[PDB]
Design a protein around this nucleic acid. Structure first.
Ligand code: MG
Ligand code: MG
Ligand code: MG
Ligand code: MG
Ligand code: MG
Ligand code: MG
Ligand code: MG
Ligand code: MG
Ligand code: MG
Ligand code: MG
Ligand code: MG
Length: 131
RNA sequence: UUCCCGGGCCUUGUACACACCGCCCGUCACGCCAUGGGAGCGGGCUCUACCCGAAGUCGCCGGGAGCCUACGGGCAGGCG
């Protein structure tokens, strides 16, 4: 037998391919289905992705934002059915896979360290030229 | 005629005149009031240095690159 293949097989039903590719450093908006009273609704969460742990179906990514004066980080499964959509709001250029150092940087300092990933922006406009 | 009791006259000192059986000082005990000091405790104002930093004006850039053109430009956008 092939244990890996069997696992991928169990997983194949839950895999998603409708979400856009993004990198650590990109700014991203995750529309997330969320439960309250007595309804479920979509809440957006928008921030820099500071990390993407890979493990195929199990890869997860972490997004950080400042909300009303307090730092928040959210961790999402990339294949979570609760994600309605992800919109790329900006491409940042990182030099590092994991950006935990931005937790201690000022807003000025961050903006200086994560400049616009001019290449991947142009690349983004190049597509988005449709038929 | 020094002394004691009483009185007369002159004088001198007096913070006494309820007139020396006068006046009056301080501690101590007691009650009341205001205050000082006192390990500290709470508050108000104020100065200094540095970190972060909204809005906004000003200044630079406006390109790997957007919109308007009125295109040697302007607006978005970025930096300070
Ligand atoms: Mg395995
Ligand atoms: Mg909400
Ligand atoms: Mg006599
Ligand atoms: Mg006589
Ligand atoms: Mg006192
Ligand atoms: Mg006292
Ligand atoms: Mg004090
Ligand atoms: Mg004080
Ligand atoms: Mg400091
Ligand atoms: Mg400053
Ligand atoms: Mg121009």
């Amino acid at each position: 037998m092939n244990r890996g293949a069997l696992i991928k097989l169990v997983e194949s039903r839950y895999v998603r391919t409708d979400l856009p590719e993004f990198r650590p450093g990109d700014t991203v908006r995750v529309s997330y289905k969320v439960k309250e009273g007595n309804r479920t609704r979509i809440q957006d969460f928008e921030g820099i992705v500071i990390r993407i742990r890979r493990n195929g179906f199990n890869t997860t990514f972490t997004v950080r934002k400042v909300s009303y004066g307090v730092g928040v980080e959210r961790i999402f499964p990339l294949h979570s059915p609760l994600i309605q959509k992800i919109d790329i709001v900006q491409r940042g250029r990182a030099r590092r896979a994991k950006l935990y150092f931005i937790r201690n940087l000022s807003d000025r300092e961050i903006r200086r360290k994560l400049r616009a990933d001019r290449k991947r922006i142009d690349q983004d406009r190049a597509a988005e030229r449709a038929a």
